[PDB]
C-alpha cells in the first residue's frame, strides 16, 4: 500500500507534468465522499510546488433513480448545475484537481472553455501508483492520435463475431495520457487511451461481448456472450442468456430510447493497466480505469454524447471494453487480435 | 450521492409519515457498526420536529458460528437478550429508529407490545433516497393485504418448474410499507411488500431458483437452477450443480433439521426496487432490500418462525426472491409472469 | 451548551436575516483551525434555505513574529495575499460566511467592492447563541449611526482621568449589528456597536485604562491604571506600573512607530454582551466580542487604518474598551457614566 | 458483530496461550491501513496481562506493479527492508502482534532467530472470534505434523482428475495452530493447518481445480475446471475455458518463469473454517483464511520458496485449496474424499 | 496559524540541521496526548529526507499526586521506567523526535549513552515557527558556553534586591540551541539558552522575584515580590505577599526538604523568545519556552539535580526567569540590566 508521504510525492510529480509552479493557481474540488488522503496529498503537493492553492467543496448531488455507487452510472445534472458561483470559483483556477467526478457536463465544458485545465484523480492511491503518468505515455497516445485524426472510418472485427463500422469525420479525437498540461484540456490520472465518436446515425453492424469481456459499471467479466445489433448508430438488438436479460432490464429501467445510442469508440494504449485487475477488486474500490485503458482493448460506450455537441442528454451510460479485437482505421490495422500494431511509435 | 443536509431532510419526511411531532419521544438505537451519518440524521431530524430525542448505544452482540457481515444470516440472541434495562430504555420511547438491526425476538416483541413502534433504517443513504417511503406505497400494500387476509391458500407456478402450494389460515399477514405510523408497528425503510406463513407441516411441491434468481444472504444471481422439493412444509431435496452443492453445504453447517422449514411467503409491491440493483453493489453495502421488495417477485424464506409462534427457532435464515412467477390466492392470480395483476389498487 | 441541531437552526435564522434564499449563492470560507461544527451548521443551513452553497478552504497563513492564537493580534498579509483565484472564488458568492477571520485587508475590501457581502462567524456556539442577532439590534445601531454621521467631533471623559478629543469628518461611520443583509457590506455575528476614525493627525489628550478596563488581545482586566497620552493622533506616553511596562514591551517588539496610532473610536450598544464575560473564559475560547460590544463602553483601537484609506499598514493591533465613560458627539452626550443616554431609540 | 470489550477479551485469551505475562514485552506492529480496533484491543489486552507494551508504526511499503489490496498477492521487499532500526525495535519485544502483515522475509527470519515470537492478526474481528484458537487445535496439528515429518512422498488424487506426486525430505514441515507460544515461533490467528515443500525440481502430475475449488488472491469459486500439468516441480500447462485464460494472463503479467513453481503443499485441520465462508464476504474483508484452513482441503501454492532456502524469490504468489481430495503420505491416506482419516488424534 | 504543509517543511528544516539523511533512522516517540499534527509532520519530513522512519507509541505514565497538565511540574518515573524493550526500540534509532516529553531519567541518559540523539518537540506549531532553529543561534549559544566552562563562579544582582553567588567547577555546562545534530545530544525545539549547576551546598544570598518575574509551572507574572533567602544551596526563606504564600503552600505539599535545593542556573540567548508571550497564551498551550529562553533572562530552577549526579531525586520542579539582572562570570558581566553584553559573539 501507498503511504501518505508517497501519495504527496506522486501528486508533486503529476502536478509538475501538469505545469503547476509558483505562477499557477490550483483548485482541489471535493465532496463529502472524496478520499481525504488524496484531497490532502493534492493540497499539500500544490503548496510544495509554491502554487496558490484552495479547496472547493460542493454538497453531493443525488440522482434518486441511480443504482450503485459508481459516479459514471448516471450522467445527468451535477453539483454545478445551476451553481454558477461554484463554477466561477473553479474557472478562477489555472488547474482543477477533480476528486468528486464532475461528469462531462455543460458546466465542465464552460470551465474548460475559459482555459482552466482539469485533472480527474479518484482511483485509489495504489492504482494511481501502478499507472503513475509518464511523458512517454503522452508521446505514444499522441502518435496514435495522428492516425485517428486522419481516419474516415473505424472498423472492429473479432473471432467472437464483432463486425462493426463507424464512419468518422464529424467529431474530434480525444486523448487521455494521465496529466492536464494544456490549458482548456481535461485528463484523468490514471489513463492512456484515445477515442472519437461515430458520425450521427451512421454506426452499423454487430458488437459481441465475448466470455471474459466487461460491462462498466456492472464490473463483471461476461460468463455468457452478449450480441449487440447496431443500426444507424443505435443498439436495436441485445441477445444472449442471463447477462443479456440483465443488461436489457437495466437499460429499459431508464425508460428512454437514447440509452441505446453508441457514443465514444477507441482503443487502449496503457500496458500498466490490466484486463485481470477488476477481478482482484470490490466494485466500490473505484471506476476500474484498468478495464477502460488496457493495451489493445476496443472500448465503446452507450448513451449521452452531449459533451461533443451530440443530441443525447440521457443519464444511462455504459463503458464496454472488448479483448482480442482487430481494429482498423480505413482498413489499415491499429490493433490485431488485441495487440497494438500501428503506429509503431504508440507501441509499449 | 446523498449529502448530510438531504439525509436529515429524508429523516424529517419519514419521521413525519411515522407521526413524530413534539408530543412524541424517539430513541435512536445504535451499536459501534451503525452508520454515523444515518444516526446523526435521525437525531437531527427528530430534534427539528421538536420530538424528545435520545440515542441508546448497545455493545454489539456476536454469534461466534455466524459467517459473513449480513445480520439477517444468523437469527439467535441479540444485544437485548438478558439486557432488561436496555429493553426498558427502548420501551420508554414512542418510536425507536433501529440503526443496528435488532432481529425479531421475544424482547423486540415485548417492546412492540408496550405500544412503542420501531423503524429499521440500515441500508445506505442512496438506497433510502431511491425508495423514500410514500403514503401511496402504504395504500397499495394495504390493498394487497385485504386480499391476503381472506385467502385460504397461496400457489406459485413458473415456466422454470415452480409448482408450490401453501394452505393459509393459521398465521397473520405482515406488511412493510417503509414507515412506523401505528403504535406497536414494526417497519423497514425501505420496503413495499407483504407476506404470511403457511399452515404448519402443510407447504408442498417444487420451488425452482431459475438462472437469475437470488439467495440472500449469499447475494448472488444463480448461474444454474436449484430445485427445492418441499413436503409437509420442509425442503427434503436440493438438486442442481455448484450453487446446489454450495447451498447444501451452507445449510448442513448449522447441523439442525429446522433449517429446511419454509417460513414466510409473499410478493413484492415496490416498483422503485430493482432486481438488477444487487449486481451494482458489494455484499457489505447492505442486506439488499431491492431483492426482497422488487415489484412482482415471489419471496420465500427458510429457518426460524417463532416470531409468529411457530416451533422453529434455528438461526439459519435464507430469503429467496423468484422472478417471472404466477402467484395465486385461492385460484385468483395476484401476480402473472412477475407482473402484479390484482388487486387493481395495488399495481 | 449548544447542540448541532440548534447551531444549524441559529445559522438558518442569521442567514435569513442576511437575505439568503434560492436566488443567492453562499461561500463558507474555512481553514484547518475553523470550528468544524460551525462550518457544517453554515453549509447545512444554507442548503436548507435552498441557497447554492460551496465551501472554500485556504491553507492557514502564518505570521512567524506573531504571538498567541488571537487572529486580531497580527494584522498583516492573509491567505488571500497574491491568491487572486481564491479571491475570485469568494467574489463569485453573494454572501461569504467567514469562519477563518479574513482580517480587514485590501483583498476583503476588493471582495466587498464587487457587491459580495461577508459575515464573520468565529466565536464559540454558546457565545453565538447569547448574542443571536435581532432586527431590533439593527434598528438601535442605525439610530446611533444617525448621530455619529451628524457629528464633527467625539469626546471622552472619565472620573479616572480620560479627557480625549477626536475631530471627525474625514472617515465614514461603521456599524456591526450582527448580520450581512446589505450588498458590499461586512458584519460580525456577534456584535452590536459602531465606530469611526479620527481625522488624520488630530486626536488629542488622555485615555486612562482604569482598574477593570481591558486590553485585547491580552484579555486581562487591568489591576493597575495605565495612562495613554495622545498628541496629533499618536500615543506619545504609556505610564503606570507592571501593566504599563508589559504594554510598552509588547508594542516596542513590533519595532514600528505606526503601532502608536489611534484607529477606530466608538461605543457599545449590545446589552447581551457583558463586561464580566471575559473573566469566565480562557484566552483561546475566542476573540472576546463581549469586551468589544458591551452596552455603554467606549472602544478605541491602535495600529492599522489601511481599511478606510489611512496611511498605517502596521500589524500590531489593540482593542481597548473603557467602562464608566462620558462620551460626547460635539456638545451632545450619547453615553454618561457608561449608560447609553442618546439617541433614545438606540437604548435597550 | 464483535464489541470492543469482547475483542479485548479475545486478545487476552490468545496472548495468554502465547505465554504473555508480567515477565514479557509485547510490541504491536501497525501501519496506516491497520484496523484501529484490533491495535487497541492488543494494546489493552497486553496491559491487562501486566506485560510491558508499545506500538511500532511503519510507513506502508508499496509494490507499484501489485494489483488489488490483498498483501499475499505480491511477495517482495517489506517495510523492514533496509530498516534495521525498526527490525531491532521489534527484536526488543518477547512477542510482536503484527496487524500490518510483514511478509515472510530475511528480516522477519532474523527477528524470529533472536527468540522473539510473532502472532499475525489481520482478519476481521468476527473471523477472529469464529476461529478463536484452542490448545486442542495445536494438539491435532502437531499429531498431523509427526506423520508429515517422516513421510518420504505426498500424493493427491481426486475424481475430478487430480493425480499429483511430490517427493519429500529436502524441506521441513511447518504448522499454523493460531498462537505464538514458543520462542522464535511465527503463527497466524486464525489458522489450523500444515504444509511442506516438494524436493527441488521433483513434483509431477495433474492438479485439477474442480468446479467450486478456489484461487487466492482471486477469491473466486471456479465455475469450470482448470487442469494444471506439473513437470519437475513446475506448472507447464494451464487448460480450461475462462478461469484458465484469466489465470494464464495473471501469471504471465509478472514476466518471470519462477511464478509456475510449486511451493507449499499440505492439508487443512480447521473445522471452524468453512469452504462456503468466502462466498459471504467481499474481497477486501480479508485474505480468506477459511479457504486456506478448512478441514480436509489440499492446499498448494505457487511462486517464491526462499522462506525455506528454495531458489525462487518471484513476487507472484497463489494459494489454491481443493475439495474432495484423497491425500497420501507414502501409501498412508491422511485425507479420503476431503475427510481427515489419519492421524486419529488429529481429527476434529 | 501554521498549515500542515508548512509544519512538514519546518520539520524538514530542523531534521536537516539535526543531520538526518538517507543514512539515519528516526523514531517518532508519542503517547495518546501527543499533537497528531506534529507527529504526522515529523513522520512525513523524515520520509521525505529518505530516513528510515518508525513511530513508537507508549502508554502514558501518570503521577497520581502531580497537579496541572504541565509535565515539567513532576520529575519522577516515566513511561520508560521498567520498560527496557521500549527503551531499546528508541536506542535502535540515530535520532528520536520526542513528542511526549521523557523527563531527564536514568533511562533517557542510557539512550543518549548509545549515541542516539534526542530532539524534544512539544510546543505548538506557531511557537515552533516563531523560534525555528538557526545555525546562528547554535554559534551564539556555543560562544557563551566557551566563557561559562572557564567560569569559577556565577553572580546575580538586580535593583529589586537579587544578590546571589554560586561557586562553579563541580558540574558541566549544558546548551540548548534547538536541534540535535551531535550524537548523544539532547536538545529542544525551541530554545536558545545555557546553564550549569552550583557546586554542592555552596549557592548563597538572595533571589528576588520582582513584579513581572515568572514561576513555571504556575505560568503567572508576579504582582507582588517574592524574596528567596538561600544558604548552602537551599531556599531557607520565602517572603512576600500572596504569591509567596501560594509558593510556600505548593512546595510544602511535596513534604520533602529536597524541593528547596537550587538546581540549574543560566541566562537566555533567544531574542525571538519574548517575556510578554506567556501572557497571550492559556496554561495548557505548552511549557512556555519563551519564559525560559528570552534574551538576557537569569533562569534558575529548584528541586532534582539527579540528572548531573547531584543528590536530589525530588519530583517538585520550578523554573524561575528574572528580568533586568546583572549576571557575572568571575568579575566579567555576561548580562547588564537584562541586556546580553559578553561574549560579543553571543549577542
Ligand atoms: Fe463512455
Ligand atoms: Fe425470511
Ligand atoms: Fe481595532
Ligand atoms: Fe502460499
Ligand atoms: Fe528546572
3-state secondary structure chain E: CCCHHHHHHHHHHHHHHCCCCCCCEEEEEECCCCCHHHHHHHHHHHHHCCCEEEEEECCCCCCCCCCCCCCCCECCCCCCCCCHHHHHHHHCCCEEEECCCCCCCHHHHHHHHCCCEEEECCCCHHHHHHCCCCHHHHHHHHHHHHHHHHCCEEEEECCCCCEEEEECCCCCCEEECCCCCCCCCEEECCCCEEEECCCCCCCEEEEEECCCCEEECCCEECCCCEEEEEECCEEEEEEECHHHHHHHHHHHCCCCHHHHEEEEEEEECECCCCCCHHHHCCHHHCCCHHHHHECCCEEEEECCCHHHCCCCCCCECEEEEECCCEEEECCEEEEECCEECCCHHHC
CB of D235 closer than 8 Å to CB of D302 = yes
CA distance B202 to D99: 52
C in contact with A (at least 3 C-beta pairs within 8 A): yes
Chain C neighbors of E129, CB-CB under 8 A: 62, 64
**Minimum-distance CB partner of C246 among E2, E132, E279:** E279
CA distance C22 to C36: 24
D276 φ/ψ angles, rounded to the nearest 5 degrees = -80, -15
Q: Residue A38 to residues A6, A14, A335, D63: CA-CA distances in angstroms?
A: 11, 13, 35, 18
Give the E-side interface with A, CB within 8 Å. Answer: 3-6, 8-9, 40, 43-44, 47-48
CB of C122 closer than 8 Å to CB of C29 = no
Torsion over CA of C86, C92, C96 and C98, rounded to 10 degrees?
0
Which ranges of A74-134 would DSSP assign to H, the alpha helix? 84-91, 106-113, 125-130
Could you tell me the end-to-end alpha-carbon distance of chain C, in angstroms, rounded to an integer?
A: 26
E301 Cα–ligand 5 center, Å: 4
Q: How far is C25 from chain B (nearest CA, A)?
A: 16
CA distance A20 to A211: 44
Cell of C334: 450619547
CB of E119 closer than 8 Å to CB of E102 = no
CA distance C160 to C157: 8
CB of C261 closer than 8 Å to CB of C305 = yes
Q: Which ligand is nearest to the CA of B174?
A: 2
Give the B-side interface with D, CB within 8 Å. Answer: 31-33, 59-62, 64-71, 73, 217-218, 220, 223, 241-242, 245-246, 249-250, 253, 282-284
Cell of C170: 474625514
Q: How far is B92 from chain A (nearest CA, A)?
A: 35
E316 Cα–ligand 5 center, Å: 10
Subunits with 3+ C-beta pairs closer than 8 A to D: A, B, E
CA D125-D130-D132 angle, 5° bins: 85
D150: which residues sit within 8 A by CB, 6+ positions away?
A: none
Q: Residue C337 to residues A254, C159, C297, E66, E189: CA-CA distances in angstroms?
A: 75, 9, 9, 48, 50
DSSP string spanning C269-288?
A: -BTTS-TTGGGGS-GGG---
E99 φ/ψ angles, rounded to the nearest 5 degrees = -105, 10
**Minimum-distance CB partner of C283 among E1, E282, E290:** E282
**Across the interface, do D220 and A6 touch by the CB < 8 Å criterion?**
no
Name residue C188's beta-bridge partners.
C120
CA D173-D113-E116 angle, 5° bins: 155
Q: Which of A130, A128, A110 is nearest to A118 (CA)?
A: A110
DSSP β-ladder status, D95-98 and D52-57: unpaired
Please state the separation of Cα B64 from the chain's center in Å: 23
A49 Cα–ligand 5 center, Å: 43
CA distance D147 to E69: 62
Cell of E330: 568571575
Chain D neighbors of E59, CB-CB under 8 A: 43, 47, 53-54
CB of D226 closer than 8 Å to CB of D302 = no
CB of C59 closer than 8 Å to CB of A42 = no
**Minimum-distance CB partner of B59 among D3, D277, D282:** D3
Cell of C300: 478605541
**Residue pairs spanning C and E at CB distance below 8 A:** 71
**Across the interface, do E52 and D84 touch by the CB < 8 Å criterion?**
yes
Q: How far is C92 from chain A (nearest CA, A)?
A: 5
Q: Strand runs (DSSP E) across B68-183, as ranges?
A: 95-98, 117-120, 153-157, 163-167, 174-176
**Minimum-distance CB partner of B60 among D3, D282, D290:** D3
Sheet holding B193-196, edge to edge: B174-176, B193-196, B262-268, B298-302, B318-322
Chain A neighbors of D223, CB-CB under 8 A: 223
D154 φ/ψ angles, rounded to the nearest 5 degrees = -115, 140
CA distance C273 to C81: 33
CB of C115 closer than 8 Å to CB of C157 = no
Name residue E326's beta-bridge partners.
E157
Q: How far is C282 from chain E (nearest CA, A)?
A: 7
Cell of E199: 557546586
CB of B65 closer than 8 Å to CB of D126 = no
**Across the interface, do B250 and D3 touch by the CB < 8 Å criterion?**
no
Cell of C127: 457565545
C155's enclosing H/E stretch is strand C153-157
SS3 A166: strand
The radius of gyration of chain B's CA atoms, rounded to the nearest angstrom, is 19
CA distance D21 to E28: 27
Q: Residue D116 to residues A293, B70, D165: CA-CA distances in angstroms?
A: 47, 39, 36
Residue with cell 537551599: E234
Pick the residue of E58, E85, E95 with the most D CBs within 10 A to test the interface with D by mutation. E85
D263 Cα–ligand 4 center, Å: 7
Cell of E24: 539515519
- Could you tell me how many residues make up chain E? 347
Cell of D188: 497466524
CA distance B56 to D281: 29
Cell of D111: 527477528
Cell of B81: 437478550
E264 Cα–ligand 5 center, Å: 6
Q: How far is A106 from chain B (nearest CA, A)?
A: 20
Q: What share of chain D is helix, strand, coil (3-state, %, to 5)?
A: 30, 30, 45
CA distance B183 to B167: 30
Q: Residue A340 to residues A149, A153, A273, D33: CA-CA distances in angstroms?
A: 17, 18, 14, 38
**Across the interface, do A89 and C59 touch by the CB < 8 Å criterion?**
no
Cell of E136: 546562528
Q: How far is A120 from chain D (nearest CA, A)?
A: 20
Q: Which of D264, D243, D274 is nearest to D348 (CA)?
A: D274
The residue in chain E having the minimum alpha-carbon distance to the alpha carbon of residue D44 is E59
CA distance E244 to A29: 59
Chain A neighbors of B279, CB-CB under 8 A: 218, 220, 246
The residue in chain B having the minimum alpha-carbon distance to the alpha carbon of residue A281 is B282
Count of CB atoms within 10 A of residue A40's CB?
19
Cell of D92: 526488543
CA distance E53 to D211: 47
Cell of B97: 429508529
**Across the interface, do C40 and B8 touch by the CB < 8 Å criterion?**
no
- Tell me D129's DSSP state: H
Q: Please tell me the number of Cα atoms within 13 Å of B29 on its side-chain side.
A: 30
CA distance B27 to B29: 6
Which ranges of chain D would DSSP assign to H, the alpha helix? 4-17, 36-48, 84-91, 106-113, 125-130, 135-150, 242-253, 289-293
Cell of E122: 512539544
The residue in chain B having the minimum alpha-carbon distance to the alpha carbon of residue C41 is B5
A170 exposure class (CB count in 10 Å sphere: 0-12, 13-18, 19+): middle
Cell of B37: 451519518
E in contact with C (at least 3 C-beta pairs within 8 A): yes
Q: How far is C122 from chain E (nearest CA, A)?
A: 15
**Across the interface, do B48 and C3 touch by the CB < 8 Å criterion?**
no
Amino acid at each position: 500500500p501507498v503511504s501518505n508521504a508517497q501519495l504527496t510525492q506522486m501528486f508533486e510529480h503529476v502536478l509538475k507534468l501538469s505545469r503547476v509552479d509558483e505562477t499557477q493557481s490550483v483548485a482541489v474540488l471535493k465532496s463529502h465522499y472524496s478520499d481525504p488522503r488524496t484531497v490532502n496529498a493534492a493540497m499539500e503537493a500544490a503548496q510544495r510546488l509554491k502554487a496558490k492553492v484552495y479547496a472547493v467543496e460542493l454538497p453531493a448531488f443525488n440522482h434518486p433513480t441511480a443504482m450503485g455507487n459508481d459516479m459514471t452510472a448516471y450522467c445527468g445534472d451535477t453539483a454545478l448545475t445551476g451553481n454558477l458561483a461554484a463554477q466561477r470559483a473553479l474557472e478562477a483556477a489555472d488547474l482543477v484537481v477533480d476528486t468528486m467526478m464532475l461528469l462531462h457536463s455543460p458546466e465542465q465544458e464552460q470551465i474548460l472553455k475559459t482555459g482552466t485545465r482539469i485533472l480527474l484523480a479518484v482511483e485509489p492511491p495504489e492504482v494511481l501508483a501502478r499507472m503513475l503518468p509518464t511523458e512517454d505515455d503522452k508521446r505514444r497516445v499522441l502518435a496514435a492520435e495522428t492516425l485517428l485524426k486522419q481516419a474516415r472510418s473505424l472498423h472492429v472485427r473479432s473471432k467472437a463475431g464483432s463486425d462493426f463500422h463507424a464512419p468518422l469525420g464529424q467529431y474530434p479525437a480525444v486523448t487521455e495520457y494521465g496529466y492536464a498540461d494544456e490549458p482548456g484540456r481535461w485528463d484523468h490520472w490514471p489513463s492512456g487511451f484515445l477515442f472519437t465518436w461515430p458520425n450521427e446515425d451512421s454506426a452499423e453492424g454487430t458488437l459481441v461481448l465475448d466470455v471474459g469481456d466487461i460491462i462498466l459499471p456492472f464490473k463483471n467479466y461476461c460468463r455468457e456472450r452478449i450480441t449487440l445489433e447496431i443500426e444507424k448508430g443505435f443498439i436495436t438488438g441485445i441477445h444472449g442468456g442471463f447477462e443479456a436479460e440483465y443488461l436489457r432490464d437495466y437499460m429499459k429501467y431508464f425508460n428512454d430510447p437514447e440509452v441505446y445510442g453508441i457514443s465514444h469508440i477507441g482503443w487502449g494504449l496503457q500496458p500498466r493497466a490490466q484486463w485481470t485487475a477488476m477481478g482482484l477488486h470490490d466494485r466500490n474500490d473505484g471506476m476500474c480505469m484498468d478495464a477502460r485503458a488496457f493495451y489493445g482493448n476496443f472500448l465503446f460506450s452507450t448513451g449521452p454524447n452531449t459533451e461533443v455537441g451530440g443530441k443525447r442528454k440521457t443519464p444511462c451510460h455504459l463503458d464496454i471494453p472488448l479483448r482480442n479485437c482487430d481494429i482498423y482505421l480505413d482498413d489499415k490495422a491499429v490493433v490485431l487480435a488485441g495487440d497494438v500494431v500501428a503506429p509503431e511509435e504508440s507501441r509499449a
